[PDB]
Scaffold this active site. Sequence first.
Site, PDB file in Angstrom:
ATOM      1  N   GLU A 142       0.819  -1.206   0.000  1.00  0.00           N
ATOM      2  CA  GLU A 142       0.000   0.000   0.000  1.00  0.00           C
ATOM      3  C   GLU A 142       0.856   1.260   0.000  1.00  0.00           C
ATOM      4  O   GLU A 142       0.552   2.209  -0.725  1.00  0.00           O
ATOM      5  CB  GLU A 142      -0.977  -0.015   1.163  1.00  0.00           C
ATOM      6  CG  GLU A 142      -2.034  -1.076   1.006  1.00  0.00           C
ATOM      7  CD  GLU A 142      -2.950  -0.837  -0.193  1.00  0.00           C
ATOM      8  OE1 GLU A 142      -3.246   0.333  -0.515  1.00  0.00           O
ATOM      9  OE2 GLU A 142      -3.389  -1.823  -0.803  1.00  0.00           O
ATOM     10  N   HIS A 192      -6.336  -6.606  -9.833  1.00  0.00           N
ATOM     11  CA  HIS A 192      -5.703  -7.581  -8.945  1.00  0.00           C
ATOM     12  C   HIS A 192      -5.605  -8.966  -9.562  1.00  0.00           C
ATOM     13  O   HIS A 192      -5.011  -9.864  -8.953  1.00  0.00           O
ATOM     14  CB  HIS A 192      -6.454  -7.717  -7.615  1.00  0.00           C
ATOM     15  CG  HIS A 192      -6.431  -6.488  -6.757  1.00  0.00           C
ATOM     16  ND1 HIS A 192      -7.428  -5.535  -6.790  1.00  0.00           N
ATOM     17  CD2 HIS A 192      -5.536  -6.063  -5.831  1.00  0.00           C
ATOM     18  CE1 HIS A 192      -7.154  -4.585  -5.914  1.00  0.00           C
ATOM     19  NE2 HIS A 192      -6.006  -4.874  -5.327  1.00  0.00           N
TER      20      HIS A 192
HETATM   21 ZN   LIG Z   1      -9.200  -6.022  -6.584  1.00  0.00          ZN
HETATM   22 ZN   LIG Z   2      -2.912  -2.424  -4.373  1.00  0.00          ZN
HETATM   23 ZN   LIG Z   3      -4.906  -2.347  -1.614  1.00  0.00          ZN
HETATM   24 ZN   LIG Z   4      -5.833  -3.887  -3.685  1.00  0.00          ZN
END
Ligand SMILES: [Zn+2]
Ligand SMILES: [Zn+2]
Ligand SMILES: [Zn+2]
Ligand SMILES: [Zn+2]
Length: 316
Positions: free
Chosen positions: A143, A231
Amino acid sequence: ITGTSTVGVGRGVLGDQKNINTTYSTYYYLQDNTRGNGIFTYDAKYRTTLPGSLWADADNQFFASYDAPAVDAHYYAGVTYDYYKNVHNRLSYDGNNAAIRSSVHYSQGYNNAFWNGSQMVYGDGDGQTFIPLSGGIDVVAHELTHAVTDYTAGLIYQNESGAINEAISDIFGTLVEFYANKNPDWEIGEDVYTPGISGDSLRSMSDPAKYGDPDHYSKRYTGTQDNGGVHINSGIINKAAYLISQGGTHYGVSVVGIGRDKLGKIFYRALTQYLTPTSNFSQLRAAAVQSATDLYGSTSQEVASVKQAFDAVGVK
Ligand SMILES: [Zn+2]
Ligand SMILES: [Zn+2]
Ligand SMILES: [Zn+2]
Ligand SMILES: [Zn+2]
Ligand SMILES: O[C@@H]1[C@@H](O)[C@H](O)OC[C@H]1O
Ligand SMILES: O[C@@H]1[C@@H](O)[C@H](O)OC[C@H]1O
Ligand SMILES: O[C@@H]1[C@@H](O)[C@H](O)OC[C@H]1O
Ligand SMILES: O[C@@H]1[C@@H](O)[C@H](O)OC[C@H]1O
Ligand SMILES: O[C@@H]1[C@@H](O)[C@H](O)OC[C@H]1O
Ligand SMILES: O[C@@H]1[C@@H](O)[C@H](O)OC[C@H]1O
Ligand SMILES: O[C@@H]1[C@@H](O)[C@H](O)OC[C@H]1O
Ligand SMILES: O[C@@H]1[C@@H](O)[C@H](O)OC[C@H]1O
Ligand SMILES: O[C@@H]1[C@@H](O)[C@H](O)OC[C@H]1O
Ligand SMILES: [Ca+2]
Ligand SMILES: [Ca+2]
Ligand SMILES: [Ca+2]
Ligand SMILES: [Zn+2]
Ligand SMILES: [Zn+2]
Ligand SMILES: [Zn+2]
């Protein structure tokens, strides 16, 4: 707060003991004055108001269960700062020693953690899908790496550019996990995901297909879910990065591994010098090839291995 720099001790989410840098003024605060403009950790007290209260402790000992997410958010922000400074000569996420602020105990049963543009925010999880997410150094560094991206290339969080954005965060999250060299791996979130299940994670960089993520461009997701699969399609780039570092033969293409340090140098240069907000996978390949050329020379093994890895995942 103004006070004396002190060193406390406590236990993190996984029960491991570590020292933390604090500041003393009546109470001991989770304020680390040793890194840039400071690392500051706050208690959101199960609310969603941010940042909350700067974390105060009476005795500089952080062994209570309630303390554990704060210990790890604070400590792993420090490790991430140290990685970027020592490895890449980058001072905090913005390169200008911005203070790193984190809030823990955000909301209730919140199965997520995020950089919000100005600070880190960590849920405690629901105890089944996740335990408190700051327990995962790769999550913390993933992050915070979004902040690095925001302050450099500015990759957009959708479609191919968004998948690159997520892979960059997985790559550097993993490189921080190796830098911190306690329990590193090429998995993401294994320390905090599914406490009842050993050996799993949110996704695998070494074998994305283990969790149904693509490991080749021909298998990319083209639907609208997940901002166009950011993702999911990250698996294609994650696999390329894994191959650059560790080597292997993937869909019949052999890749000579060059190790983690060179992977990190190549991708850091690509991110900071060559990527743009809408870079696609082909442009990432070109950026990585040019970065390896800058660092190691056009005839180098490093350049050849970058090309092999992108070939193996079908990115021309
Ligand atoms: Zn995602
Ligand atoms: Zn991310
Ligand atoms: Zn994230
Ligand atoms: Zn994420
Ligand atoms: O906020 C203060 C910080 O600026 C200084 O560097 O170290 C002591 C702290 O109290
Ligand atoms: O086992 C951990 C414990 O050591 C710590 O103090 O609080 C959180 C727990 O998960
Ligand atoms: O500012 C803090 C707020 O964020 C929290 O939710 O309630 C207590 C306050 O001190
Ligand atoms: O143990 C305490 C917990 O019961 C409460 O929820 O918030 C503060 C903690 O110290
Ligand atoms: O100041 C800019 C900021 O607004 C943005 O969040 O990230 C890039 C910075 O340069
Ligand atoms: O080998 C080291 C690697 O493990 C770390 O992740 O990044 C720096 C390198 O020196
Ligand atoms: O086991 C399956 C795996 O083989 C595939 O790659 O993705 C879905 C999984 O269910
Ligand atoms: O549909 C998009 C696809 O065209 C691209 O290749 O990868 C991201 C997806 O969202
Ligand atoms: O298109 C970019 C190119 O201009 C540069 O040379 O390397 C990075 C690429 O993504
Ligand atoms: Ca205490
Ligand atoms: Ca990991
Ligand atoms: Ca698990
Ligand atoms: Zn690990
Ligand atoms: Zn393979
Ligand atoms: Zn493989």
